[PDB]
Structure 1
Amino acid sequence: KCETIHVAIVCAGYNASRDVVTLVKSVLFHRRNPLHFHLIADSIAEQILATLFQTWMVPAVRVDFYNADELKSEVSWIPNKHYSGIYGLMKLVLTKTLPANLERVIVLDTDITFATDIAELWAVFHKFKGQQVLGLVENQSDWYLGPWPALGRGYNTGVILLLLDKLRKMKWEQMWRLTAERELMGMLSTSLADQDIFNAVIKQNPFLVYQLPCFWNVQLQCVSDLKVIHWNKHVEFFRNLYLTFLEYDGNLLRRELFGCPSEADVNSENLQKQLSELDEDDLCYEFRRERFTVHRTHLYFLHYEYEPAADSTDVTLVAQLSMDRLQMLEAICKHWEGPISLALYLSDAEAQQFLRYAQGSEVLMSRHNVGYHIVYKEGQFYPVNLLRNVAMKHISTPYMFLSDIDFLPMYGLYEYLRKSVIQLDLANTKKAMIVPAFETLRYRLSFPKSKAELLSMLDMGTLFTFRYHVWTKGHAPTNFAKWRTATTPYRVEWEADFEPYVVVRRDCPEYDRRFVGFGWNKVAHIMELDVQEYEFIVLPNAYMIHMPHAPSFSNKQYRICLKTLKEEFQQDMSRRYGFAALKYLTA
């Protein structure tokens, strides 16, 4: 029928989070039933996958999280060759942690790929008989034939089918615990973690197992017949399946399936709401719809480790990019030694291309303090403020430096900003520190190593003020004339369309998502800063340089619609704040 199929997965860390996304893409493509994922996760996986599934909005898919750390005390007495083995052991205790009403589940490891509809494997449960409660595929390796005890060749636990009711009725907890203790007296440690334990139980209790055909867990023989693949001539085809699912557009999987009632979690309810309230006749409909659009988000795509800073002064460089600016990553890493947060607007293919590039970069693999957040492409305009908000929400520091992927910061800018947060008393007062922005017209080989070199180059016409030839306003309030000779930080007041690059405390106002596509977004943000009486201080020894780039993908209606978005922003601001808004409209 439309019965819901229940899938339990243990997943800890960043790699497992990626891998489970790939598994889930595989199940969804061929699925025809509702799905309920029970993710037993550590804190890292729980955060990443929680946000991921919230923003994915897959119809008819429920996801429950179970804290895996709170489970280690159940299996930590069983020694393992690899510490990660403890997570494997946790399958043994699913009967305890899963809800009591849940009668049967399919357990999968993260390196499993589906090649068919999961309803078939789920249907195999009906062929169980009597005291059969475990469904497993023979271990296709000769590990147990030549080592913990096993029944014949033994069984692989990458794919397990559990009758939870019967397992609870048989008091499975006591049984596997006794078996484990009894065998652990002789064998000192488990090599293959849960797998070992399971085989011993099935060896001791050969009535428990129902052997699944080889083809429900193809451990990489028996291409039509192969249905579930397990990684560790026909290999090239399956590697192409795996690559096909890595790169397959997750957004295509939001497809609804009738016959079955769908569930719109809570975010989908409100999205449907907002898209209904809209005026379809209005010619800026795409702008309003992308004001409310929800993108798949995969936080912390790569391994991440932040080292707690002594001071409460640490600063994160925050930026966003699409694939055409991948070239900037390493450059920034050479110039900025502190933590970095990046929102990357990619397609799934581009996400995996980025994966390969980053793993093949010495600088990127040596940096563990850069969080790379993937916002998957959707719709027609570059959601610059969505991206900025995603990057700036997920930082590990009290202060952040809001930059572009296209600037290279001054060498030593990071430590200088920390000294500045101390010097300008950013801990006790509401201030926005400005980093003066300059530009170059072609890539250069010697980067200025001092403000004196900066000034010499500027006097030769090889460096210029940022956007100097198009919008001299926007950075003119910085006053580069007095910055030139200044030695003390100095205060500047707000002017129309002013758009500096600032370092601020992390809980500052976010960007307004109504301004999709290229427009007056940063200007609106700076106005938001100025109403809340953020003080604009220019730093006498800081600077950043914009690298030249080709334009990225100008209809008259688009100009008109931006103008209407600007108007509606000023009107929501007049209502939002009050008399304070007036000094900005006269601009």
Structure 2
Amino acid sequence: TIHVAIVCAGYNASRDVVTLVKSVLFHRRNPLHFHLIADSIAEQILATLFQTWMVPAVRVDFYNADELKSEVSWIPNKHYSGIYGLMKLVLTKTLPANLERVIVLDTDITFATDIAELWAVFHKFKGQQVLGLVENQSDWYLGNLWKNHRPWPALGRGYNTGVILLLLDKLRKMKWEQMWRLTAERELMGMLSTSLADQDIFNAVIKQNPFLVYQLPCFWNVQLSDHTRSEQCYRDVSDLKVIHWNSPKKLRVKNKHVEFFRNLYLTFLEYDGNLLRRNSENLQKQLSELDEDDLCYEFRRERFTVHRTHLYFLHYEYEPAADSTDVTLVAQLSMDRLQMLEAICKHWEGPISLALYLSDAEAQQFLRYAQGSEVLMSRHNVGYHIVYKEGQFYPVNLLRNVAMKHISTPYMFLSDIDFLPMYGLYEYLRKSVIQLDLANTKKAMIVPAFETLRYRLSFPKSKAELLSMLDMGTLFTFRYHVWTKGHAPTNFAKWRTATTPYRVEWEADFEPYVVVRRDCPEYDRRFVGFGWNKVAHIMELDVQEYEFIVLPNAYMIHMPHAPSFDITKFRSNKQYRICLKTLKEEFQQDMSRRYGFAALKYLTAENNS
């Protein structure tokens, strides 16, 4: 068995840990056991990520850091990592005595070869040589990079904490705790604070006792920074196994042959991690009896699938409000449709949770785009949950549920990414929510839907101006030429004169856009793709005696968009339609079973139609 421990904190390092994990997994032979010293947010994200990865012969265990933040709090730090840099100092207190030797990797490492070869070095230590480390490739500790430099004392050039190799389960038998605490206290009275966090103190702990360390080969930790001489430490491609990026620039580091290093960085990150799979047994014995001859075999197989979800891709933050009535949009988006994102961002003020569906490479494409555009960065309160690509269908309900569950306000709005709201729709929905008093009853609010057929139009301001455009003829009701029954029962002719909200019942194929509490039912997953992805939720919410209210002054208007293959596959072959109807009626019978007489209504409708 190979064991390893990584400190994780912040969204950036959570991403670094995912890249490191795929790099390591590329060359595995043996079972692996990780230990992530993580805070609350990173733990929440990575638990789900690793629970959905389904990797065999891997066990991942997370150790809280908030409780153990105080252990090093007395040591001031200036490293960009923060207080979490010193967390590499108290692993013995966290990791139980059950283990004997364990790797320790910083989040930025990217393994180029098998980690078993590194694990091999745990039988090459002599006598009291317990700690494994590699010599720093810079001249930071030598005190000669620039005038008036006073680095912490160390032996020779100093050693870098990129890769730590522990062993003997001796650090407890030798009382490491007291000595390191005493060393740290002694090395803080003269100078101000640490410079490299753990790497700053460990070097001193090496100097005061030179014989614990085992001076590994330099070409083990090929540090990449502005003052590296690794060209002596590396000769060819095969002379390279593990690379570090010990600069805040990271991707913007400069070297003589940095091109090959950038290649070696994108060689693992680009890999589609869904091909690394060579809570489970349940999935196998449900997939086992899926009849291939069944007309819905592909759908049945797809429904049970689990896809790699990476919650909170970019930095997120939200200060809760006392009104406890805030709403948050939900949308499903793909890389064929991301251009109008900014349009939507400028038209929403409250928190919004999306759910992307990307393919690794494209995922990164989106990363570069978002890191370029200033509009997304100016806004800190937008989530990004990317459920990576897998299979051939479009599990839209999956992504909608993923955006549903992780939401920081009690209320939510269901819509599509192709639409667009007014200026201040957030505020009006807050007022309407606080007025209709949905805190107790199970009621829903509906925002009417329209569409337009001209790319470059101005954005209306008021209701009168809107109805002016409508009768001018540039706008119509949503789906007024393909699926008329979707919104026709709203009979906007009635709404035009409306001044207070009014309630409506359900009509055939009646698919509005709802604002609802966080307890609303999850979308039924058997249906994936395009078509009948919303109406099922509507009939679910209706059989549960949820009333509908249609807001008089709110509206939302569709922006033209090109078609995708989902609608084409919805119009291609009759088998897809037959399977769709099959699942429809299946849902009706089972829904009746769980509720009964109330469901007969819908059944009668199909008899009438």
TM-score normalised according to structure 1 size? 0.96
Cα deviation, 1:190-230, whole Å, max 9, x if unaligned, reads 01110111010100000110112112210014221110000
1:445 deviates by 3.2
Q: Distance in 2 between matches of 1:498 and 1:211?
A: 72
1:241 deviates by 1.9
1:516 deviates by 1.3
Structure 2 partner of 1:94? 91
SS at structure 2 position matched to 1:73: coil
SS at structure 2 position matched to 1:196: helix
* Residue number among 269, 292, 312 corresponding to 1:246 in the alignment: 269
1:90 deviates by 1.2
Cα deviation, 1:216-253, whole Å, max 9, x if unaligned, reads 21001422111000019432112112123222101011
SS at structure 1 position matched to 2:51: helix
Q: Distance in 1 between matches of 2:257 and 2:34?
A: 30
SS at structure 2 position matched to 1:136: strand
| Equivalent residues of 1:95, 1:164 under 8 A apart | no
SS at structure 2 position matched to 1:371: strand
SS at structure 1 position matched to 2:385: strand
| Equivalent residues of 2:37, 2:63 under 8 A apart | yes
Cα deviation, 1:352-374, whole Å, max 9, x if unaligned, reads 11111111111100111111001
1:182 deviates by 1.2
| Equivalent residues of 1:135, 1:210 under 8 A apart | yes
| Equivalent residues of 1:105, 1:164 under 8 A apart | no
| Equivalent residues of 1:75, 1:86 under 8 A apart | yes
Structure 1 partner of 2:154? 150
1:86 deviates by 1.8
SS at structure 1 position matched to 2:431: helix
Q: Distance in 2 between matches of 1:205 and 1:527?
A: 72
SS at structure 2 position matched to 1:387: helix
1:187 deviates by 2.1
Deviates more, 1:112-121 or 1:232-241: 232-241
Q: Distance in 2 between matches of 1:85 and 1:444?
A: 48
* Structure 2 CA distance for partners of 1:438 and 1:164, relative to 1, 3 Å: farther
Deviates more, 1:245-254 or 1:136-145: 245-254
Cα deviation, 1:48-67, whole Å, max 9, x if unaligned, reads 11111111111111110000
Cα deviation, 1:9-49, whole Å, max 9, x if unaligned, reads 00011111111000001001111111111000011110111
Structure 1 partner of 2:434? 422
* Structure 2 CA distance for partners of 1:50 and 1:22, relative to 1, 3 Å: same
Deviates more, 1:115-124 or 1:281-290: 281-290
Work out the percentage of aligned pairs sharing the same amino acid: 100
SS at structure 2 position matched to 1:315: coil
Q: Distance in 1 between matches of 2:293 and 2:494?
A: 51
Deviates more, 1:440-449 or 1:507-516: 440-449
Q: Distance in 2 between matches of 1:404 and 1:395?
A: 17
Deviates more, 1:554-563 or 1:126-135: 554-563
Q: Distance in 1 between matches of 2:240 and 2:219?
A: 5
1:285 deviates by 0.9
Q: Unaligned regions of 5+ residues in structure 2, if any?
A: 144-150, 225-231, 246-254, 565-571
| Equivalent residues of 1:85, 1:192 under 8 A apart | no
Q: Distance in 2 between matches of 1:203 and 1:585?
A: 81
Q: Distance in 2 between matches of 1:330 and 1:534?
A: 34
| Equivalent residues of 2:79, 2:85 under 8 A apart | no
| Equivalent residues of 1:336, 1:409 under 8 A apart | yes
Structure 2 partner of 1:188? 192
1:276 deviates by 0.9
Structure 2 partner of 1:260? none
SS at structure 2 position matched to 1:251: helix
SS at structure 2 position matched to 1:545: strand
| Equivalent residues of 2:445, 2:549 under 8 A apart | yes
Cα deviation, 1:168-207, whole Å, max 9, x if unaligned, reads 1111111111111111112221011101110101000001
Structure 2 partner of 1:586? 604
Cα deviation, 1:284-321, whole Å, max 9, x if unaligned, reads 21100111000000000000001212311211011111
| Equivalent residues of 2:23, 2:269 under 8 A apart | no
| Equivalent residues of 2:327, 2:410 under 8 A apart | yes
Q: Distance in 1 between matches of 2:203 and 2:79?
A: 19
Q: Distance in 2 between matches of 1:344 and 1:486?
A: 37
SS at structure 2 position matched to 1:74: coil
* Residue number among 221, 240, 243 corresponding to 1:226 in the alignment: 240
The answer to whether structure 1 residue 577 and structure 2 residue 589 are counterparts is: no
Instruction: Map 1:37-116 to 2 at 5 A.
Output: 37-82=34-79, 84-116=81-113
* Structure 2 CA distance for partners of 1:397 and 1:164, relative to 1, 3 Å: farther
SS at structure 2 position matched to 1:470: coil
Cα deviation, 1:490-523, whole Å, max 9, x if unaligned, reads 1011112111011111111110001112231211
Q: Distance in 2 between matches of 1:544 and 1:94?
A: 54
Q: Distance in 1 between matches of 2:324 and 2:129?
A: 59
The answer to whether structure 1 residue 118 and structure 2 residue 115 are counterparts is: yes
The answer to whether structure 1 residue 309 and structure 2 residue 321 are counterparts is: yes
* Residue number among 380, 387, 392 corresponding to 2:392 in the alignment: 380
Q: Distance in 1 between matches of 2:495 and 2:273?
A: 49
SS at structure 2 position matched to 1:157: strand
| Equivalent residues of 1:477, 1:493 under 8 A apart | no
| Equivalent residues of 1:531, 1:581 under 8 A apart | yes
SS at structure 2 position matched to 1:418: helix
Q: Distance in 2 between matches of 1:15 and 1:161?
A: 25
Q: Unaligned regions of 5+ residues in structure 1, if any?
A: 256-266
Q: Distance in 2 between matches of 1:284 and 1:162?
A: 53
The CA RMSD measured in Å over matched residues stands at: 1.3
Cα deviation, 1:51-105, whole Å, max 9, x if unaligned, reads 1111111111111000011111111111112474321111111112112111111
| Equivalent residues of 2:133, 2:165 under 8 A apart | yes
| Equivalent residues of 1:8, 1:38 under 8 A apart | yes
Q: Distance in 1 between matches of 2:218 and 2:511?
A: 63
Q: Distance in 2 between matches of 1:302 and 1:97?
A: 29
Q: Distance in 1 between matches of 2:127 and 2:432?
A: 73
1:444 deviates by 2.4
1:164 deviates by 5.3
SS at structure 1 position matched to 2:506: coil
SS at structure 1 position matched to 2:582: helix
Q: Distance in 1 between matches of 2:111 and 2:70?
A: 32
Q: Distance in 2 between matches of 1:287 and 1:395?
A: 28
TM-score normalised according to structure 2 size? 0.92
Structure 2 partner of 1:343? 355
| Equivalent residues of 2:489, 2:507 under 8 A apart | yes
Deviates more, 1:476-485 or 1:99-108: 476-485
Q: Distance in 1 between matches of 2:467 and 2:503?
A: 21
SS at structure 2 position matched to 1:318: strand
| Equivalent residues of 1:433, 1:503 under 8 A apart | yes
Cα deviation, 1:382-423, whole Å, max 9, x if unaligned, reads 101001000011111111111111111111110000000012
Deviates more, 1:541-550 or 1:421-430: 421-430
SS at structure 1 position matched to 2:102: strand
Deviates more, 1:187-196 or 1:272-281: 272-281
Cα deviation, 1:323-354, whole Å, max 9, x if unaligned, reads 11111211111111110000001111111111
| Equivalent residues of 1:55, 1:297 under 8 A apart | yes
Q: Distance in 2 between matches of 1:296 and 1:193?
A: 33
Q: Distance in 1 between matches of 2:261 and 2:603?
A: 61
Q: Distance in 1 between matches of 2:502 and 2:189?
A: 73
SS at structure 2 position matched to 1:456: helix
Q: Distance in 2 between matches of 1:207 and 1:518?
A: 66
Q: Distance in 1 between matches of 2:168 and 2:177?
A: 12
SS at structure 2 position matched to 1:457: helix
1:155 deviates by 0.5
| Equivalent residues of 2:355, 2:399 under 8 A apart | yes
* Residue number among 578, 602, 605 corresponding to 1:560 in the alignment: 578
| Equivalent residues of 1:219, 1:229 under 8 A apart | yes
